[PDB]
Amino acid sequence: CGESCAMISFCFTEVIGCSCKNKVCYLNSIS
């Protein structure tokens, strides 16, 4: 999703569908 939850375990793009995983925000294995 081109975003990282390295600081906070909450991504901006998480709200639209993405999800925080191992510090990186992914959506169905998509960055």
Give the total number of structural domains in the chain: 1
Q: 3 is in which domain, residue-wise?
A: 1-31
Q: How far apart are CA 3 and CA 9, in angstroms?
A: 11
DSSP tag of 4: E
The experimental technique used to determine this model is NMR
Q: Which residue in the block uniquely carries the two structure tokens 């375990």?
A: 9
Half-sphere exposure of 18 (CA within 13 A, CB side): 20
Task: Please tell me the distance from the alpha carbon of residue 3 to that of residue 21, in angstroms, as a whole number.
Answer: 11
Q: What share of the chain is helix, strand, coil (3-state, %, to 5)?
A: 0, 30, 70
